[PDB]
Design a protein around this ligand. Sequence first.
Ligand SMILES: Cc1cc2c(cc1C)N(C[C@H](O)[C@H](O)[C@H](O)COP(=O)(O)OP(=O)(O)OC[C@H]1O[C@@H](n3cnc4c(N)ncnc43)[C@H](O)[C@@H]1O)c1[nH]c(=O)[nH]c(=O)c1N2
Ligand SMILES: Cc1cc2c(cc1C)N(C[C@H](O)[C@H](O)[C@H](O)COP(=O)(O)OP(=O)(O)OC[C@H]1O[C@@H](n3cnc4c(N)ncnc43)[C@H](O)[C@@H]1O)c1[nH]c(=O)[nH]c(=O)c1N2
Ligand SMILES: Cc1cc2c(cc1C)N(C[C@H](O)[C@H](O)[C@H](O)COP(=O)(O)OP(=O)(O)OC[C@H]1O[C@@H](n3cnc4c(N)ncnc43)[C@H](O)[C@@H]1O)c1[nH]c(=O)[nH]c(=O)c1N2
Ligand SMILES: Cc1cc2c(cc1C)N(C[C@H](O)[C@H](O)[C@H](O)COP(=O)(O)OP(=O)(O)OC[C@H]1O[C@@H](n3cnc4c(N)ncnc43)[C@H](O)[C@@H]1O)c1[nH]c(=O)[nH]c(=O)c1N2
Lengths: 370, 372, 370, 372
Amino acid sequence: TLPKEYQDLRDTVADFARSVVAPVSAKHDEEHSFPYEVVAKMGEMGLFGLPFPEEYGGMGGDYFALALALEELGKVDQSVAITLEAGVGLGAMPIYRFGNEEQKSKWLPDLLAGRALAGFGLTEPGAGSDAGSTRTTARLDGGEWVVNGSKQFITNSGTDITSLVTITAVTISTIIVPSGTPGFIVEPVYNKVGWNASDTHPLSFDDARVPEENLLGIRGKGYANFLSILDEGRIAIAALATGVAQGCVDESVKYAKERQSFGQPIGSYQAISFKIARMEARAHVARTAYYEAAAKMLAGKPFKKEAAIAKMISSEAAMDNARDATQVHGGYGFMNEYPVARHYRDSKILEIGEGTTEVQLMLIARSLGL
Amino acid sequence: TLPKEYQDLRDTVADFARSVVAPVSAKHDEEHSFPYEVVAKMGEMGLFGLPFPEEYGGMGGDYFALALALEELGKVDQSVAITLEAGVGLGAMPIYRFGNEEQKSKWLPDLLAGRALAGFGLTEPGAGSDAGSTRTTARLDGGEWVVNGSKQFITNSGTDITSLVTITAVTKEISTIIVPSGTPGFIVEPVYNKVGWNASDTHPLSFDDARVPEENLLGIRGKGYANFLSILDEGRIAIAALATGVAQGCVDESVKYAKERQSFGQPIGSYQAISFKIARMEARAHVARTAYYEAAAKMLAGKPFKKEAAIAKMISSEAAMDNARDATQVHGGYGFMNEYPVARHYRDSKILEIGEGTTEVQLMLIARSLGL
Amino acid sequence: TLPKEYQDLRDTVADFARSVVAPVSAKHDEEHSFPYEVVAKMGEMGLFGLPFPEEYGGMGGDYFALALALEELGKVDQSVAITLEAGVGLGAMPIYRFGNEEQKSKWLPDLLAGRALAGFGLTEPGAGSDAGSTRTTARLDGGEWVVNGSKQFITNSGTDITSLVTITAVTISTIIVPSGTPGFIVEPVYNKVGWNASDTHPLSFDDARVPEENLLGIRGKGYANFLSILDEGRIAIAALATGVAQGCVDESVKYAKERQSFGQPIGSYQAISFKIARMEARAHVARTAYYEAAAKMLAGKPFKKEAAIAKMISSEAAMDNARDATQVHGGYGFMNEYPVARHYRDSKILEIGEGTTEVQLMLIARSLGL
Amino acid sequence: TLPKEYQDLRDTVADFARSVVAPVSAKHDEEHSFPYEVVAKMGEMGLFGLPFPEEYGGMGGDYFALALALEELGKVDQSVAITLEAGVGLGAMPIYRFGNEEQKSKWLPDLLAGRALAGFGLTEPGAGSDAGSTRTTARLDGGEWVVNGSKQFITNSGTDITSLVTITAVTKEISTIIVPSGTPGFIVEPVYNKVGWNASDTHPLSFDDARVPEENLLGIRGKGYANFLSILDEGRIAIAALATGVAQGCVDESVKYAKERQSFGQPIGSYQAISFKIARMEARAHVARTAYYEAAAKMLAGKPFKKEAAIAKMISSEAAMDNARDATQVHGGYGFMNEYPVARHYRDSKILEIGEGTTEVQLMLIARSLGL
Ligand SMILES: Cc1cc2c(cc1C)N(C[C@H](O)[C@H](O)[C@H](O)COP(=O)(O)OP(=O)(O)OC[C@H]1O[C@@H](n3cnc4c(N)ncnc43)[C@H](O)[C@@H]1O)c1[nH]c(=O)[nH]c(=O)c1N2
Ligand SMILES: Cc1cc2c(cc1C)N(C[C@H](O)[C@H](O)[C@H](O)COP(=O)(O)OP(=O)(O)OC[C@H]1O[C@@H](n3cnc4c(N)ncnc43)[C@H](O)[C@@H]1O)c1[nH]c(=O)[nH]c(=O)c1N2
Ligand SMILES: Cc1cc2c(cc1C)N(C[C@H](O)[C@H](O)[C@H](O)COP(=O)(O)OP(=O)(O)OC[C@H]1O[C@@H](n3cnc4c(N)ncnc43)[C@H](O)[C@@H]1O)c1[nH]c(=O)[nH]c(=O)c1N2
Ligand SMILES: Cc1cc2c(cc1C)N(C[C@H](O)[C@H](O)[C@H](O)COP(=O)(O)OP(=O)(O)OC[C@H]1O[C@@H](n3cnc4c(N)ncnc43)[C@H](O)[C@@H]1O)c1[nH]c(=O)[nH]c(=O)c1N2
């Protein structure tokens, strides 16, 4: 059973998700338009500050509290959930966990308050996201950094409220490039299978200059810093993917009670009711998986293995429940007007981002000695 | 081994698919634009007339030749493949199989030559596509049919070359009425925002007192739904072939991508996790292909092929869905980008489990064939 | 994280499982011989008394404590685990939860101490285990009950230490038939796919007489009593099935480090190491599933839905991990000498007993309104 | 449609399987007793001589005819089917394909007529079945080969009618030596306690200074493992057919059981959960059958069939495993009772994913065929 503080938050975000987020989800998906009005209301709720102390502007909660919110948002609109997830985990977290009093005090308050978004630029075109692959070069001249390179698939990097993008550059540490830096160009959005409302851009740097004080962490330790906070993001996206799986149940249950076939609701036929029952089982064990992962994290125990399992299994519950949810909806399962249709498109990236399934299996395998 | 005539057609459509269809596939998907220039090239190739006798403008072939062509188109662009499949199976076939000499001579030559497209309007909003569910009424007043109702998810019903849409209508007496496009009560509503098949033409249809000549009654008064039920199996074979091509296309792309893309100094195809996944993908497409070849073989021998087609369609559609999820995995982040074929195959393929009889409907048929 | 009391018990039974149970598992499986020496040592540990108060002879623990023990035993030998599971859940539990001070004081102390075993006879040949199907008739004459009928697949019903079999009989309540009752005949064991060492018998009753005081619960309420304690058994077998899944990982990990192919251990090839990594994920989420189920039960909250999901998912983790574990072992996967081979045979019944998968899906479906 | 000769054989073996093999299948499984009376009846039917020319005692048929027969035997009893499959593929075939005129005339007539059984001893304890792993040495001393080593999991190597066991031996020069049974150093160790195939004869073999004539060298000195690798594909087809029969047998049994067994007043086959599961089972067996038919068709046309056989074998073995797990589910508690065919199919089928090249080996082959 969930404690009051967490159960109260779950109820508030879920209420938010049904009353505020769901009515506009179809519009932003069709338009590919970033939901600024939803992000600002999430910011005023403090969701962007949940896993941060009131010191730097956060709400003094934890990552499990954020996880509960992401599950409730994931049920309804993945683009909104991933904007929150990526903002906290990829924008603010590298600055909060590796930035001095000045860096944290300059950038975090806006990020933590939902007034601004930050992104992390690691992936590059043609590069294998390894340490060996990073072809983006950075050179120090006096009190300013000079960056030359290109990044690919960077979330939250080109909104009207993006303040900075922390990037990786071979010198390899983490450098905070404010948006508006002359060499910093935000290329146009991608045409993606899904997450249509989520902001995603390629980035290019031609002799961009930023202050010396913008180095994130110690010179040479930025990639190591990233790996050390990856595990919280596996939990966060496991919760998002779990919400997706549950949203697919919820919609399919709703749809099965309305839609008729040969005089009875389609849920009266075992093939539909059993398929939905299995979907609810998948979502449930996905939820116990990431609760267990968060429990270890909050207790200070190791949670890398549990998070990797939680993320893989969750992502598979979302994909499987989306394919089943669209089957339950029939022709409507092929119409972007219906939530489960958008979930079918959106969920493919859940098996790929935050470490591919193959990466999670490698981690689990190494944990056994293989 | 495949006989010469069929291997020749397969090779020609494959060249067509790689040289003509693929280069423009990305533009049409992004734009949601109907590929008129591709449909015109398919029409001159004879593909819309492949299973129809020369008398009406056809090529004197069969549904297997059409299935071979659909597999090659499915590899590359599902919207183009389903435009052909629906044009033949739902546009020309109901007029060729149940229309009199006049109906056939007036409508088939343009359809069979690809100069026009035809649609079949059965599904309605709120209805379970049964005969008991058909709320679209058509009323005889003098010498004209007066139709009031609405159809949903009708393919090929609103292109610049759509000539007619045959609909099912209560007259529970259910007949089929040929509604030419341009009929005053006939409104083609705006396109749907669909998960996939972005380039394929799909519309809701509405009829507010549309009047058409009495000679437009297709088949016997009251037997139009029954006639539709009787010719369904060829389309199951046709779409199993399309889904088989999708499954194969996902393999082809993943193999090329796996040989180029690098990870830790070796192409990702050097790792068993990728190469075994692609090998399994290739196994799925192969047995899907043997399944629908057998269904067509029985059809061509004049033997029963309902059960074999139902299996071919189910297994094929699942090979497409599974191979699209694996192919996008192999492509990594690129698998989430509509510029890549496999990403479009992941979106497009979901309707393959739903149309031409849902998986649950195929399982029902197979079950009944066993005595269940 | 697990509290000390539970973690201590988990360590003791696991130690028991490796040192006492595993050395004799192959012998009893080959011989189809009931492991009396293992059952007596489990009894002296008090495992048969774990979910019962010290009052009636039990150890004053809970069903979760029993669940932890069953997982550790399930890892090694299903026949031993199911003997414990069925003894507690089907022998003692109907008497503990529905028997008067005298009935509990007469029978439970031996059951709870592992000195005796009791079974539950509900299934009948040709009957669908519904209330409508029970063709076994019972008639009251004076101070004795007279029973006529036949039962099928009754666990623990014909060992040298079986004291009684509580049965269902249409009159429909629960009647305690002591072993040795003249009309009570124990037919010979079945040749089963698996659980070779587990005791299983058809039962036949031709005018057997037992005292009036032997009525279990109220006349007419015995089947209702059974349904009301079914949910604890779903948790118990979910834990057993989870242990099986983990045992298959453990053995496959052990085997993958020893067995060579083309100069390297077979776990160096991704196809083997990834398959084992997935197996560990299945066992892990099965374990979070039934922990969650037990948590609700111990808190007094409803746990029927959670138990049904836990049992289904667990049983599927055992079957899937057994098929993968035998693949990892190659030809040895087809040899009853190896634990994972016995797990492949044994696990089929996990999808069937304690409510079939179809029954669990029906329950989950009804919980959603379908 | 199947040609007359093949349909005739299929019908005959099917009658055999239902009339002769099935009634005794339960007794042999419980007893672990080799079915000599079944093997003698198969021998007089010619099944062990089906793919061998008349000259050596065979029936002048092919491996497809044998595959058809194995599918019918697999439906009913896998131990009987694998006795035939291993007898032909591992006993007679290596002598027919690589032995001189004398070797063939001395050993093939009894094998091809079922009066004797032969085994192939390659696998050894601790070895990865590679040539580099073969630790069994055979030494030429005067005119006799002196063999020291051990073989593991050797089918048909210890029956009352086993005549010989061909083994692989280091001479890393690897040759094949024909060891007749009764040779002084040749010890047939006691049977294994196996998960399934309880009635099929399986033994570890040990050689402590066994001497056999020099004329027993099979093939060229040093080429015996290479020869074995070259004839593997026919056995993949043969066992895909066996696994296909297993898959079909599980359907057949589940259909009969589903029509009789009741639940809440209707047979369990009236519920979609059971009828759809059985319909899917039927789909799996059908596409498995189309897969291995295509592999055999290519083989018979003289075309490459390695890739097609590998797919047929993998997909077949998985159809058997999946259908056995579903069929035992349909049978409920009875699915856990060795008296029922599907329960025995659940135990027997696991080795179908492991023998005749593991699933991982088939995926490797398919992958290599794509350039991976
Ligand atoms: C883009 C596109 C294009 C087309 C079409 C759709 C789309 C999206 N269609 C319509 C399509 O054929 C139709 O939607 C499908 O047959 C599915 O029917 P329903 O949506 O009514 O599902 P329906 O409402 O029948 O069923 C929903 C779900 O319940 C299941 N189910 C239903 N009855 C059941 C039962 N008794 N037991 C168990 N499960 C059961 C189904 O299997 C499905 O999963 C169409 N139509 C047309 O008229 N002309 C056209 O040209 C096209 N083309
Ligand atoms: C919408 C969206 C949003 C984001 C991102 C992507 C997208 C599409 N990303 C990028 C994302 O994290 C990245 O694409 C994934 O890590 C996958 O990397 P590749 O596409 O290079 O796959 P890659 O080339 O690594 O691999 C392709 C396939 O091969 C497999 N594979 C690779 N190596 C293997 C091996 N050794 N053994 C076995 N299998 C192996 C992988 O598992 C995968 O299935 C991102 N990035 C970023 O920097 N910042 C951001 O904010 C975001 N956000
Ligand atoms: C009852 C019975 C009957 C017979 C046989 C076995 C049994 C049990 N056999 C032996 C059988 O053919 C053999 O066991 C299998 O080929 C499997 O080989 P291993 O046990 O060595 O598996 P092995 O040790 O090769 O492999 C174990 C596991 O690792 C995997 N693996 C191996 N290498 C890998 C790689 N490089 N990459 C990825 N995965 C890899 C395999 O796929 C498998 O899952 C036999 N033998 C014989 O000589 N004569 C006979 O008549 C018979 N008949
Ligand atoms: C070794 C062992 C040990 C035990 C037991 C069995 C075995 C083999 N059992 C019996 C066991 O609990 C029983 O066999 C199962 O409940 C399954 O019941 P049936 O075999 O009658 O299946 P049944 O006939 O109910 O069903 C067969 C199949 O159809 C499905 N099905 C049935 N009705 C359906 C419906 N309406 N909709 C959809 N699908 C449906 C089921 O899910 C199953 O897959 C037992 N019994 C006992 O009394 N005491 C004991 O101690 C034990 N222990």
